Amino acid sequence: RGSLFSRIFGKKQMRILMVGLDAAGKTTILYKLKLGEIVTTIPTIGFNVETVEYKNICFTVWDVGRPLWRHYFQNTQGLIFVVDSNDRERVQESADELQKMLQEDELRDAVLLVFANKQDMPNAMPVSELTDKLGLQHLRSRTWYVQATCATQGTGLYDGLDWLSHELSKR
Ligand SMILES: Nc1nc2c(ncn2[C@@H]2O[C@H](COP(=O)(O)OP(=O)(O)O)[C@@H](O)[C@H]2O)c(=O)[nH]1
Ligand SMILES: [Cl-]
């Protein structure tokens, strides 16, 4: 009945937080999921949140780089971090914002999926290089994976979520 994405997580409640710098490709990704309408709410002044929710699946999105964050963090099961692989000037900023997330105690048990997006672009930073620059090899007791993606084509998004689904299958 729903999209291919609607079945990727089975029936159990799935709470995903997907963040990144502005223009990383997050809205594009939500739209490819085909899990229904992208709805924007402003639960506190200056804090725009996008949500796609389909039955047992809830994706919450905002830009990075607040007291309200904690309630999301506390039961977030998957953390998706989206990076514009072609924006070399902002990779350090992206990396710092990811590290800040990973340092939040309330996100301690989140499985981390990194979407290395805009891999279609000629000057995109290779996944190996990006993985190094985001500092992921220094992480201890975090389950993580970096997925090459082209959100505008859709490429990689199911691959990444399939991985995340397997990692969280016993949630
Ligand atoms: N070349 C390329 N452009 C992309 C890709 N993903 C998203 N974009 C473009 O990047 C811009 C920002 O995307 P958007 O989804 O609004 O980013 P957001 O600010 O993170 O929500 C738009 O012009 C998208 O079409 C991609 O994989 N490749
Ligand atoms: Cl689909």
Distance 138 CA to ligand 2 centre (A): 35
Judged by its nearest atom, the ligand closest to the C-alpha of residue 36 is 2
Please answer whether residues 151 and 114 qualify as being in contact, where contact means their C-beta atoms are separated by less than 8 angstroms. Answer: no
List, as residue ranges, the binding site. 20-27, 63-65, 117-120
Asked whether the beta carbons of 128 and 112 are under 8 A apart, the reply is no
Q: Which amino acids bring their CB within 6 angstroms of ligand 1? A: 20, 22-28, 117-118, 120-121, 150-152
Is there a contact between 157 and 32 (Cβ–Cβ < 8 Å)?
Answer: yes
Tokens describing residue 65: 């780089």
Q: Closest ligand 1 atom, CA of 149?
A: 27
| Binding positions for GTP | 20-27, 63-65, 117-120
Q: Which residues contact 69 (CB under 8 A, 6 or more apart)?
A: 104
Q: Which ligand sits closest to the CA of 82?
A: 1
Handedness of CA 21, 33, 116, 80 (dihedral sign): positive
Domains of the chain: 1-171 (3.40.50.300)
Question: Which of helix, strand or coil describes residue 57?
Answer: strand
In the chain, what is the greatest distance between 2 CA atoms, to the nearest angstrom? 43
Final resolution, Å: 1.8
Q: Which residues fall within 8 angstroms of residue 137, CB to CB, at 6 or more apart?
A: 131
Residue closest via CA to ligand 1's atom 25 equals 152
d(CA 62, CA 51): 9
